[PDB]
Symmetry: D2
Subunit: 262 residues, 4 copies
Amino acid sequence: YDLSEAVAVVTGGSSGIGLATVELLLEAGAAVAFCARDGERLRAAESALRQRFPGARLFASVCDVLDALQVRAFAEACERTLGCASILVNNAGQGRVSTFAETTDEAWSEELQLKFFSVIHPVRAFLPQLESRADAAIVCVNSLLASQPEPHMVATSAARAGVKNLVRSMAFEFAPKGVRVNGILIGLVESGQWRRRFEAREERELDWAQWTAQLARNKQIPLGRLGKPIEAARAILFLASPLSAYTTGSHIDVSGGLSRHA
Amino acid sequence: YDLSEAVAVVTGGSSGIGLATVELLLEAGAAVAFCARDGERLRAAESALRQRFPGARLFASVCDVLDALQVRAFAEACERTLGCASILVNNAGQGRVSTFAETTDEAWSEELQLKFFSVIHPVRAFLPQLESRADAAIVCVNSLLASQPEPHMVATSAARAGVKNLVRSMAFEFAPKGVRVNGILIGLVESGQWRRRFEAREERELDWAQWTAQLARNKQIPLGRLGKPIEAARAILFLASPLSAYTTGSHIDVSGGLSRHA
Amino acid sequence: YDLSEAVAVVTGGSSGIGLATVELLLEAGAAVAFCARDGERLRAAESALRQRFPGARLFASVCDVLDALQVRAFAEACERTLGCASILVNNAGQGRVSTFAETTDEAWSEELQLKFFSVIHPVRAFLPQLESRADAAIVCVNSLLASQPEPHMVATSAARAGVKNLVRSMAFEFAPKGVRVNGILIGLVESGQWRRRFEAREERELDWAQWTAQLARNKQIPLGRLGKPIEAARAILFLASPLSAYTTGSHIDVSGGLSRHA
Amino acid sequence: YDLSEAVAVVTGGSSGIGLATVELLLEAGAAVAFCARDGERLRAAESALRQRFPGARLFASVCDVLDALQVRAFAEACERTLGCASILVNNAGQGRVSTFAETTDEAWSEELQLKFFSVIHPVRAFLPQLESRADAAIVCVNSLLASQPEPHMVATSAARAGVKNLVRSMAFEFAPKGVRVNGILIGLVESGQWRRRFEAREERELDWAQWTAQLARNKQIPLGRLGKPIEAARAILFLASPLSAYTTGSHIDVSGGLSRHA
Ligand SMILES: [Cl-]
Ligand SMILES: [Cl-]
Ligand SMILES: [Cl-]
Ligand SMILES: [Cl-]
Ligand SMILES: [Mn+2]
Ligand SMILES: [Mn+2]
Ligand SMILES: [Mn+2]
Ligand SMILES: [Mn+2]
C-alpha cells in the first residue's frame, strides 16, 4: 500500500531478508532507518539502496542490538532524523547448527541472548515512539523451527519458540497502545550461506537452480525450491502495513509447505 | 498487486467478505466470477460492481455450492466466459449457534456438509483449470473456531476444524500441480447477523459503532472492535496473489488478537 | 488404579485397542460393558474375558454405533445390568486410504458420519448416567492425523480433526456436569489391517516383529516400532480414571514420537 | 506400576509438586535421588519421606542445578549410591510476575537461565546413565504458559515455551539411546505461594476451599478448583514409567481445562 507517511525501522536489516524488506519499504515510499553490527555490510547496502531510490529518506547506522545503550542512541537518532517510528521490524538472524550433545552452556547462552535481546531491546526503545503513531506495527522475523524443531538446530529451535511466545504476549500487552505485533515463520530461504554451500557442492554439473532444487527435494519442501528473501519481505510488509489492521499476535507461514501441523 | 492476467472465482461471494474480496480483485484488474444462492443479492452486487468498474470482465451466476451439478456447470460457464481459473476463494458461510446438548444428528449433518462441500465442490470442479494456470492459488475462508472453539457453536467449530485440516492436505496434494492452498481465520467480523443483533439492542442511544465497540470489549478482543469485511478480504487477496508465492498449507489470523495459543 | 466402584462402557471395543482397554478395566475391578457390530468377534472376546476374569461384572452386546436407536437401547441395557455408567470410551475405528482426488462425496459423508456419530451417539446416550456419577470421564480415541494429516488419508484426517475439536467443546460444556472429556492420538499401532499388509509382504523371511520394525523405520518413527494395543489402552486408562482428575479437554500422544509440532 | 527396579532422580524436587512426585516414586518402590538449593527445605522433606517409607532407598543432597559442576558431582553421587538413573524429572520452578514493561534485562536473563539450565544440566549429566538403563524416561515439568501465555507472566511464558520446544528436540535426539522425553503443562496448582495469598485475603469469612474455589472461578478454570500437587505428580509418574512406553516428545495437560486451543 502507501506508506509515504510511515517511519519504519529495521534492526539487523542488512542481511538478505532485511535488505529485501528495506527495499519494499522504500518502494512503498516510507522513511526508513536500519542498523547492523557489521559497518561494512551496512554501507554496502546503503549504497545500492540510494542508487535505486534517489529520493528516499534513509538513515543507516552501525548498532549492536545486544547493547541496550546503543539501541537507545540509535532510536533517539531515528526520531530526531525521521520522526517517531510507526513500524519496527526485527530480523531473524541466522540459525546455529548443533545437536543438543554439540551445544555447550556458552553456545546456549549466546543463542538465547541473541534471539531474545535482538527483540527486547529495539521493542523497548521504540515502543514510546510506536505508541504515539497511528497504524503502529511490529514484526519479529522468525523461522518454522519455533513450532517445528529440526535435529541439527536444537538451541536455535528453542530460542525461536520463546520469541514466538513473546510475540503473542507483546501483541496482547501493546494492543491498548494501538500497536499490533506479529511475526513470520520462514522455511529455507536463499542466502549467502546457501550460496557458499552450493559453491562447495560435489555435483559440479548442477547450477544454482538445479542444486537448490535438489536440496529442496531432500528437504521435502512441497513447493520444490528455496524461498526468496523478497518473499519473506512481502509477508513482513503485509504485517507491518495497515493492510493487516485486524491482525495481531499471529504468524504467517513462509516455508513453502514445510509445516506438517494443521 | 497486478492481477490483470488472473481469472478469480469467489464462491458464496455476494455478502460482506465475499463482495469486498471481489472488489479488491477487480481493483487489481482481475477477471472475476462469483456465485451465490440469493440471485437478487447477487444481481444487486453485480450491478454495483459494474458501476464502479466499467471495463471489468465480470461474471455472476446463481449457484448452490452443495449441488455438485450446479457447481460443475458454473465452473464451465466461468471457463467459457472469462477463461481458465487461476484463483479460487471459498467463503466461510455463517456459523451455527448451538451447544452439544442442542445439536441433533440432522443439524450435525447439515453443518458438516455445508462447511465441507462448500469447499470440496468448487475445488474438485475448478482444479482442472487451476492446475493448468500459473500462480494458481486457493483460499478457504474459515474462522478462529477451527482452532479455538466456542461453547455456543460446537458443531460449527468441529466442522471448521475439519476444513482447516483439509486445507493442509489439499496444499500438500496440489503442490505437485502448481497450486497453492491456504485459508484465513476470521474473528468477529461485521455482518448482517451482527446488524440484526444490533437492532435488537436495549441500549437505543448506542449507534452501530458504539455498539460493536462495546460488543468487542465484552468479547475481550484486544483490538477493541469488530473486523471489517475488507480487512478479511485483504488477507485473502494476499494469500490469493503472487505476493504469497512461498506460502501454502497455512492460515492467516484475522481475529484482532483473540487467539490465545502461541 | 482401583476402579471397583466404576461402570465403564467401551464402544467399538472388540478389536485390538478396544479389547486391551476392556481387559485393563477388568484388571482394575471395574464393571464393564462393550458393544460392536461383529457379534462373533464380540462373543469371542466376551468368552476369553470371562475365562480370565471369573467374578467379573461384564456385559457384551452387538450394536451399530451409527444407529442412534441401538445405542439408546444398549445404554439402557448397561444401566439395568451393571448400573449407571461413570466411564465411556469411544474407539477410533479404522482410517480410510484415499487422497482428495480419490474421495467422492459419498465417501466423504460416510467417513464424516462414521467418525462423528460414533462419538456423538454414545455420548448423547450415556451422558445422563455419566452426569449422575462421581469421577465421570469420557475418552475419545483418535489418531495423530487429527493434527498432522497424511497424504493418503485426507478424508480421515479432516474427520479426525473435527472430533478432536469436538472433544475440547464437550470438555468445556460437560465440566459443569462433573464430566471430564479427553482423547488420545495414536500413531501406527499393530492391527488386523497391518497384519494383512504383513501377509502381502514380498520379504517372506521377515517375521511379524522384523517386518513391523522395518515398517516403523520407513515410517520414520523415532521409537522404531509400531505401538501395541495395550499401550494405547494404558493411556485411555490413565485419562478414564481418577489418576487424571485435573485433566480435561486435552489429548495424550501415543504415536511413538511422530508428532513434529512443538 | 512397579518401579522397584527403577532409579529415579528429581531435581528441584522438594517443592509441592516435586515432593508429591518423590512420594509416588517411593510408593512404586523406586530408588530415589533428589536435590534442591535450599538445604533446609530438602531435609524437611527427607525427614517426612523417611517417616512414611522406612524401607525406602533415598538419597537427598543440596545442589544448584545452575551450577554445572555441582550437578556433575550430584549425578556421580547418585550413581555410586543407587546406580545408574533410569528416570529423570526436572521440576518447573515458580513463575515470575511481570509484564513486558516491568521486566528488566536482568530479570529476563535470570528467568531464561533458570528455566533452561535447570533442564540442560541434569539432562546432560544423567544422559550417560539413562542410556545404559532400560525403560529410560525424562520428564520436564512445565506450565500451560508455554503454549498459552498470560499477561502478567511474560518472561516466564516465553522461557517455558523454549523449554517445551527443547523437550521435543531431546525426545527426537535421545530416541536412538532408548530414552523417552516428555513433559506436563500445569495450570494453577495449590502451593505455599497460594496459601500466602489466601492468608492475605480481604474476604476473611472464606476458608481455603471457598477462597480457592472463587479464585478458580475468576481464573475461568472449567473444573472450578486449583490442581493438587499429587495430580501433577500422577501425570509425571505416568510419563516416567513404562506405562507410557509409546509416548515421547509430547506433553500432558494438567490445567483443569484452561487450554482454549484444540
Ligand atoms: Cl533458523
Ligand atoms: Cl463461524
Ligand atoms: Cl486413522
Ligand atoms: Cl509458571
Ligand atoms: Mn495446534
Ligand atoms: Mn470447457
Ligand atoms: Mn501449537
Ligand atoms: Mn433406565
